[PDB]
Design an enzyme around this catalytic site. Structure first.
Site, mmCIF file in Angstrom:
data_model
loop_
_atom_site.group_PDB
_atom_site.id
_atom_site.type_symbol
_atom_site.label_atom_id
_atom_site.label_comp_id
_atom_site.label_asym_id
_atom_site.label_seq_id
_atom_site.Cartn_x
_atom_site.Cartn_y
_atom_site.Cartn_z
ATOM 1 N N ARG A 77 -83.114 -54.731 28.700
ATOM 2 C CA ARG A 77 -82.215 -53.993 28.100
ATOM 3 C C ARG A 77 -82.152 -54.218 26.743
ATOM 4 N NH1 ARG A 77 -77.464 -55.078 28.773
ATOM 5 N NH2 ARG A 77 -77.746 -56.475 30.341
ATOM 6 N N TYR A 216 -88.043 -49.581 31.038
ATOM 7 C CA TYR A 216 -87.598 -50.514 31.650
ATOM 8 C C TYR A 216 -86.272 -49.688 32.481
ATOM 9 C CZ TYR A 216 -84.748 -54.270 33.021
ATOM 10 O OH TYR A 216 -83.543 -55.106 33.764
ATOM 11 N N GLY A 217 -86.225 -50.147 33.639
ATOM 12 C CA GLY A 217 -85.292 -49.646 34.518
ATOM 13 C C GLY A 217 -83.925 -49.535 33.714
ATOM 14 N N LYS A 225 -76.913 -47.241 34.430
ATOM 15 C CA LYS A 225 -76.035 -47.856 33.549
ATOM 16 C C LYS A 225 -75.599 -46.739 32.780
ATOM 17 C CE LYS A 225 -76.658 -52.082 35.116
ATOM 18 N NZ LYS A 225 -75.483 -52.810 35.749
ATOM 19 N N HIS A 245 -68.949 -52.777 36.690
ATOM 20 C CA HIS A 245 -69.853 -53.473 36.948
ATOM 21 C C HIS A 245 -69.665 -54.571 38.075
ATOM 22 C CE1 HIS A 245 -73.522 -56.207 35.257
ATOM 23 N NE2 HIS A 245 -73.959 -55.247 36.283
ATOM 24 N N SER A 267 -75.035 -59.160 34.074
ATOM 25 C CA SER A 267 -76.088 -59.130 34.532
ATOM 26 C C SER A 267 -76.702 -60.393 34.857
ATOM 27 C CB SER A 267 -77.083 -58.287 33.348
ATOM 28 O OG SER A 267 -76.225 -57.085 32.846
ATOM 29 N N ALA A 268 -77.610 -60.452 35.756
ATOM 30 C CA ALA A 268 -78.404 -61.649 36.370
ATOM 31 C C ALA A 268 -77.581 -62.948 36.555
ATOM 32 C CB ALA A 268 -79.488 -61.972 35.380
ATOM 33 N N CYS A 269 -76.469 -62.890 37.149
ATOM 34 C CA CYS A 269 -75.309 -63.827 37.195
ATOM 35 C C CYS A 269 -74.776 -63.904 38.706
ATOM 36 C CB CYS A 269 -74.175 -63.804 36.236
ATOM 37 S SG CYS A 269 -74.857 -63.909 34.676
ATOM 38 N N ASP A 294 -74.099 -53.468 42.588
ATOM 39 C CA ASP A 294 -74.190 -53.259 41.132
ATOM 40 C C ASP A 294 -73.056 -52.416 40.402
ATOM 41 O OD1 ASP A 294 -75.584 -54.108 38.476
ATOM 42 O OD2 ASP A 294 -76.045 -51.893 38.283
ATOM 43 N N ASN A 393 -86.887 -61.669 33.816
ATOM 44 C CA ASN A 393 -86.398 -60.093 34.248
ATOM 45 C C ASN A 393 -87.087 -59.454 35.203
ATOM 46 O OD1 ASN A 393 -83.825 -58.933 34.270
ATOM 47 N ND2 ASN A 393 -84.750 -57.618 32.647
ATOM 48 N N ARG A 395 -88.483 -57.688 38.551
ATOM 49 C CA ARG A 395 -87.414 -56.587 39.240
ATOM 50 C C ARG A 395 -88.179 -56.114 40.555
ATOM 51 N NH1 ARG A 395 -81.522 -56.445 37.709
ATOM 52 N NH2 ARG A 395 -81.840 -57.301 35.708
ATOM 53 N N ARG A 426 -71.463 -66.794 33.809
ATOM 54 C CA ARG A 426 -72.320 -68.080 33.792
ATOM 55 C C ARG A 426 -71.757 -69.191 33.067
ATOM 56 N NH1 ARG A 426 -77.691 -68.813 36.001
ATOM 57 N NH2 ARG A 426 -77.789 -66.929 37.026
ATOM 58 N N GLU A 525 -73.766 -71.025 50.150
ATOM 59 C CA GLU A 525 -72.566 -71.502 50.276
ATOM 60 C C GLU A 525 -71.263 -70.874 49.664
ATOM 61 O OE1 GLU A 525 -72.824 -74.115 52.345
ATOM 62 O OE2 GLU A 525 -75.203 -74.113 52.414
HETATM 63 N N1 LIG Z 1 -77.487 -71.627 40.957
HETATM 64 C C1 LIG Z 1 -77.179 -70.439 41.708
HETATM 65 N N2 LIG Z 1 -78.061 -69.279 41.163
HETATM 66 C C2 LIG Z 1 -77.923 -68.149 41.553
HETATM 67 C C3 LIG Z 1 -76.799 -67.846 42.641
HETATM 68 N N3 LIG Z 1 -76.396 -66.632 42.819
HETATM 69 C C4 LIG Z 1 -77.650 -65.837 42.120
HETATM 70 N N4 LIG Z 1 -78.336 -66.811 41.751
HETATM 71 C C5 LIG Z 1 -79.524 -66.779 40.749
HETATM 72 O O1 LIG Z 1 -79.225 -65.980 39.389
HETATM 73 C C6 LIG Z 1 -80.016 -64.777 39.151
HETATM 74 C C7 LIG Z 1 -79.439 -63.465 39.241
HETATM 75 O O2 LIG Z 1 -79.013 -63.280 40.620
HETATM 76 P P1 LIG Z 1 -78.652 -61.718 40.903
HETATM 77 O O3 LIG Z 1 -77.914 -61.878 42.402
HETATM 78 O O4 LIG Z 1 -79.755 -61.176 41.163
HETATM 79 O O5 LIG Z 1 -77.632 -61.478 39.730
HETATM 80 P P2 LIG Z 1 -77.215 -59.655 39.392
HETATM 81 O O6 LIG Z 1 -75.710 -59.960 39.051
HETATM 82 O O7 LIG Z 1 -77.438 -58.818 40.684
HETATM 83 O O8 LIG Z 1 -77.943 -59.019 38.255
HETATM 84 P P3 LIG Z 1 -78.017 -57.778 37.807
HETATM 85 O O9 LIG Z 1 -78.577 -57.044 39.037
HETATM 86 O O10 LIG Z 1 -78.906 -57.574 36.622
HETATM 87 O O11 LIG Z 1 -76.620 -57.067 37.496
HETATM 88 C C8 LIG Z 1 -81.133 -64.732 40.363
HETATM 89 O O12 LIG Z 1 -82.283 -65.564 39.747
HETATM 90 C C9 LIG Z 1 -80.665 -65.683 41.467
HETATM 91 O O13 LIG Z 1 -81.651 -66.548 42.176
HETATM 92 C C10 LIG Z 1 -76.009 -68.823 42.755
HETATM 93 O O14 LIG Z 1 -75.066 -68.712 43.672
HETATM 94 N N5 LIG Z 1 -75.997 -70.307 42.248
HETATM 95 O O1 LIG Z 2 -79.116 -55.350 33.495
HETATM 96 C C1 LIG Z 2 -78.174 -55.090 34.610
HETATM 97 O O2 LIG Z 2 -76.961 -55.359 34.625
HETATM 98 C C2 LIG Z 2 -78.887 -54.639 35.858
HETATM 99 O O3 LIG Z 2 -79.976 -54.034 35.582
HETATM 100 O O4 LIG Z 2 -78.207 -54.576 36.918
HETATM 101 MG MG LIG Z 3 -78.234 -57.165 40.832
HETATM 102 MN MN LIG Z 4 -76.101 -54.670 36.774
#
Ligand SMILES: Nc1nc2c(ncn2[C@@H]2O[C@H](COP(=O)(O)OP(=O)(O)OP(=O)(O)O)[C@@H](O)[C@H]2O)c(=O)[nH]1
Ligand SMILES: O=C([O-])C(=O)[O-]
Ligand SMILES: [Mg+2]
Ligand SMILES: [Mn+2]
Length: 615
Positions: A77, A216-217, A225, A245, A267-269, A294, A393, A395, A426, A525
């Site tokens: 994005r 990009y998606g 989004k 979200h 995102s990605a957290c 999501d 990033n 996908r 994060r 965990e």
């Molecule tokens: N250390 C750690 N890493 C994690 C954990 N959960 C997810 N991750 C890593 O964090 C990154 C994001 O994980 P996602 O679950 O795909 O995050 P998301 O919120 O779905 O991201 P979006 O689809 O963009 O909204 C990935 O590389 C995971 O491997 C966790 O509990 N602990």
């Molecule tokens: O960027 C984001 O939040 C996604 O693509 O889920």
């Molecule tokens: Mg996700």
């Molecule tokens: Mn998202």
């Protein structure tokens, strides 16, 4: 006018006229209406294979799956190029990029004028929410990208069935997308057409969405989004519901009682991994099921409950880190019928991304790969240069029905009752593992002031702490301070029924030690934190009161099957006075920026937290 090739089942005259206007503007060579069939999906994939955009993966290792790699400038994005063009700037707010609507329309009109020359305009009809349900909304995305068309098939209810719901007079969300790379006659295309200049523009008054320059998606799947968060949050503000979200999951304890929770992580957290986690050792008889990973649409009911639906039909998830230990449900989901973008290519025609070596013999990297940029990749190259085989990033796109843990109510338009909300960024420091808010207002404060380190899901410097209220910083469709008031008014509506409000929690999986590694194992965990939340929902879980809320003691969690000591638990749950004094000053900076229409309850809550710190 150009022949639209309008199918016979399209009975909506207003829609057809809008397509005519957009065809006259974008000037595509031809127009193709997507019927959403499986046969059409295969034809479009073969067309992408012919263009070099797709490589078909080994049918024996990854059946009916494809790999796309993008231009390095089009991998995430672009928040600086995303606009909320409300009539008044104050209705976009400080968290959004604003421009006068007529002024933006004068900027985009020459960009879209002839943008699709030498290409086919694909008409992509889609429904967000189950087809024909009372909560669903229909959009039409015009795109010159077959990659968008096939991804929309997975991520939405796409195709001819939409027009049965739309009928002759139904309304729709108008969505226009172009890669911004018109082709001259005889000019050869590139495998990933795009433009260095990008715009993702939203007009809330008309619900128009315009996307230019990116395939990009996140920028190009306009139902996701752009509509289901940015446009839909505006509608929910006016109509009394929420577009968030948030993942939605169900969880059942050994006693057979089932609960549902919604969790907003940036995102990605961690949303996708939490939404389909597998309960680890020590949780025999527990089950976790996925409604969505999501986006959530939520509204209160007369019974005093909050009901949530997932408007999407698939997952568009971060690939790196996924393996059989971190997320086996996702590994099983992407066994086939998946689109992979920007991962690496094995010698046998399979895909690979960082983290998959955890399931490999000797936990070793592959001997050779072709990385997402087409370059040779070896463990020696990675050891010496740090080159990543898959983009951070990268996908996967996969249908929700591929998920073994898919909840039976995942597409139930009646929704599921939310028993608790979770918010979490994060954060390498400061924020403890889990904290329960003492009241709805304090929970809204938690969500309004949360911070998070930037990730590769958007361009820019990763690893920087920023405010991300409700994990909605890139997706809020109106002024963030009015959004805070919306959440506060919602709680008062629920309380007036006499009901107990859903609990609000703050979590942090991402505290780091002195070496930069994570102190909390996370992933599966995290069930041990979720189980404490269920205990609190049932009124059977104990906790201690501290500065920011109520946290469990070591003895309040189930540690069977995990060697995690009381000292380690103290590290990730201790409230550090100095760290939180610094954090509250960052809250004050946020409140200064969001001064306009900022609810007084947030400043009052902050003053209370400041007193507990100075006690
Ligand atoms: N250390 C750690 N890493 C994690 C954990 N959960 C997810 N991750 C890593 O964090 C990154 C994001 O994980 P996602 O679950 O795909 O995050 P998301 O919120 O779905 O991201 P979006 O689809 O963009 O909204 C990935 O590389 C995971 O491997 C966790 O509990 N602990
Ligand atoms: O960027 C984001 O939040 C996604 O693509 O889920
Ligand atoms: Mg996700
Ligand atoms: Mn998202």
């Amino acid at each position: 006018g150009l022949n639209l090739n309008t199918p016979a089942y399209v009975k909506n005259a207003k829609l057809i006229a809008w397509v005519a206007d957009m065809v006259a503007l974008c000037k595509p060579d031809t127009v193709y209406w997507c019927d959403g069939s499986d046969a059409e999906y295969q034809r479009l994939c073969q067309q992408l294979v012919d263009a070099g955009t797709f490589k078909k993966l080994n049918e024996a290792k990854r059946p009916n799956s494809y790999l796309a790699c993008s231009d390095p400038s089009d991998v995430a994005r672009v928040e600086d190029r995303t606009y909320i063009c409300s009539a008044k700037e104050e209705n976009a707010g400080p968290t959004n990029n604003w421009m006068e609507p007529s002024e933006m329309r004068a900027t985009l009109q020459p960009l879209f004028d002839g943008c699709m020359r030498g290409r086919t305009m694909y008409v992509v009809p889609f429904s967000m929410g189950p087809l024909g349900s009372p909560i669903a909304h229909i959009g039409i995305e015009l795109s010159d990208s077959p990659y968008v068309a096939v991804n929309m098939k997975i991520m939405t209810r796409m195709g001819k069935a939409v027009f049965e719901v739309l009928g002759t007079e139904g309304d729709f969300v108008p969505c226009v997308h172009t890669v911004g790379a018109p082709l001259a006659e005889g000019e050869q295309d590139v495998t990933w057409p795009c433009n260095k200049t990008k715009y993702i523009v939203h007009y809330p008054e008309t619900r128009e969405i315009w996307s230019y320059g990116s395939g990009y998606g996140g920028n190009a799947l306009l139902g996701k989004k752009c509509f289901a968060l940015r446009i839909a949050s505006n509608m929910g503000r006016d109509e009394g519901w929420l577009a968030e979200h948030m993942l939605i999951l169900g969880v059942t304890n050994p006693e057979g009682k089932k609960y549902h929770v919604a969790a907003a992580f940036p995102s990605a957290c961690g949303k996708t991994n939490f939404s389909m986690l597998v309960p680890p050792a020590g949780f025999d008889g527990w089950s976790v099921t996925t409604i969505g990973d999501d986006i959530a649409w939520i509204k209160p009911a007369a019974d005093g409950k909050l009901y949530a639906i997932n408007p999407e039909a698939g997952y568009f998830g971060v690939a790196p880190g996924t393996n059989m230990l971190t997320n086996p449900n996702c590994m099983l989901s992407v066994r086939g019928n998946t689109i992979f973008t920007n991962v690496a290519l094995t010698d046998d025609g399979d895909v690979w991304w960082e983290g998959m070596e955890q399931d490999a013999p000797g936990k070793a990297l592959p001997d050779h790969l072709i990385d997402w940029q087409g370059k040779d990749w070896t463990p020696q190259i990675a050891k010496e240069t740090g080159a990543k085989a898959a983009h951070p990033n990268s996908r996967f796109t996969v249908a929700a029905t591929n998920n073994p843990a898919l909840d039976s109510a995942w597409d139930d338009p009646k929704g599921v009752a939310i028993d608790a909300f979770i918010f979490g960024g994060r954060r390498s420091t400061t924020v403890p593992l889990v904290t329960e808010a003492r009241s709805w207002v304090e929970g809204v404060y938690m969500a309004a002031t949360m911070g998070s380190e930037t990730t590769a899901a958007a361009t820019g410097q990763a690893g920087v702490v920023r405010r991300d209220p409700f994990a909605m910083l890139p997706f809020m469709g109106y002024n963030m301070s009015d959004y805070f008031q919306h959440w506060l008014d919602l709680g008062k509506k629920l309380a007036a029924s006499g009901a107990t409000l859903p609990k609000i929690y703050t979590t942090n999986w991402f505290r780091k030690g002195t070496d930069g590694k994570f102190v909390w194992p996370g992933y599966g965990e995290n069930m041990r934190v979720l189980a404490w939340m269920i205990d609190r929902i049932e009124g059977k879980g104990q906790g201690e009161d501290h500065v920011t809320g109520i946290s469990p003691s070591y003895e309040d969690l189930n540690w069977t099957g995990l060697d995690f000591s009381a000292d380690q638990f103290n590290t990730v749950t201790s409230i550090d006075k100095a760290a939180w004094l610094k954090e509250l000053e960052l809250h004050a900076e946020l409140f200064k920026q969001l001064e306009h229409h900022l609810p007084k309850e947030l400043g009052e809550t902050k003053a209370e937290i400041e007193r507990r710190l100075a006690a």
